[PDB]
């Protein structure tokens, strides 16, 4: 049983999640299921269908000067566009977490710096199935096999995220669960360089307490779902560590793969 302060915390977090993220899991699983529409997303499964999809995005590609780059680099820069959007939504989501905006501003930066990509890859699972992922707000679907076919190092970006997502999606979380999980990821007291550690730990303790009780009520037949999710948090930290390493390889070896400045700031001296 949840007391009123805990129910209120979970409600504010869930409402903040619904307000700030355009794509969520209920919407994604409607589209992926084909049970609400006979007009499925456009499928990008090879270079021909990539270029076709890119005809819709010509204004964006020309605006950012990438229309003539190699296909893998065009894709990489479109991935960056989605990441920058999601970081922006995650920052608004974070400010809706009671207590977050009251932290030292440098601690807010640190929590976002280390947390955003953990949250991004957790939420990315919602739009992934074993065969590919939704893109462009659910209007296209890019195949896992197409992503594997890109030249190294770009074929190494998404496949470990699909691997994580297939295991994560088997937990059958809904949006109410994911919103608390993401809040817990952001409010992590173990990040490097945090100043007010004890205070952030107490914030996290409250959110993780609500997460645990919520999972016991929402998934009573998956008794150790909360421990399973604590483990997924550790898996995500490792996933992002490896991701940053690959991003560093791309910056040092790929002259056409400029990082958006916001992402450059996130990755700078990260791990």
């Amino acid at each position: 049983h949840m007391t009123a302060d805990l129910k209120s915390l979970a409600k504010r977090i869930y409402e903040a999640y619904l307000k700030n993220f355009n794509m969520n899991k209920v919407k994604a699983r409607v589209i992926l299921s084909g049970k609400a529409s006979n007009n499925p997303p456009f499928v990008i499964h090879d270079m021909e269908t990539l270029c076709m999809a890119e005809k819709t995005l010509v204004a964006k590609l020309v605006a950012n000067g990438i229309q003539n780059k190699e296909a893998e680099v065009r894709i990489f820069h479109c991935c960056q566009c989605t990441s920058v959007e999601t970081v922006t939504e995650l920052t608004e989501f974070a400010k809706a977490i009671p207590g977050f905006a009251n932290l030292d501003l440098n601690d807010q930066v640190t929590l976002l710096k280390y947390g955003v990509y953990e949250a991004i890859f957790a939420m990315l699972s919602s739009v992934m199935n074993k065969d590919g992922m939704l893109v462009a707000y659910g209007n296209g679907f890019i195949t896992r096999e197409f992503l594997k076919s890109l030249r190294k190092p770009f074929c190494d970006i998404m496949e470990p995220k699909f691997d994580f997502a297939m295991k994560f999606n088997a937990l059958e979380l809904d949006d109410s669960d994911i919103s608390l999980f993401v809040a817990a990821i952001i409010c992590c007291g173990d990040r490097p360089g945090l100043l007010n550690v004890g205070h952030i730990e107490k914030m996290q303790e409250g959110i993780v307490h609500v997460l645990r009780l919520h999972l016991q009520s929402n998934h009573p037949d998956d008794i150790f779902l909360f421990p399973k999710l604590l483990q997924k948090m550790a898996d995500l930290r490792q996933l992002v560590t490896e991701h940053a390493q690959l991003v560093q390889i791309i910056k040092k070896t790929e002259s056409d793969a400029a990082l958006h400045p916001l992402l450059q700031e996130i990755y700078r001296d990260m791990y």
């Binding site: 920052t91 608004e92 400010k95 807010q108 930066v109 400045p261 916001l262």
Partner: peptide, 12 residues
């Protein structure tokens, strides 16, 4: 900091 700018923005 670009992150600080996002963090200091008024609620939408």
């Amino acid at each position: 900091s670009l992150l600080k700018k996002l963090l200091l923005a008024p609620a939408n």
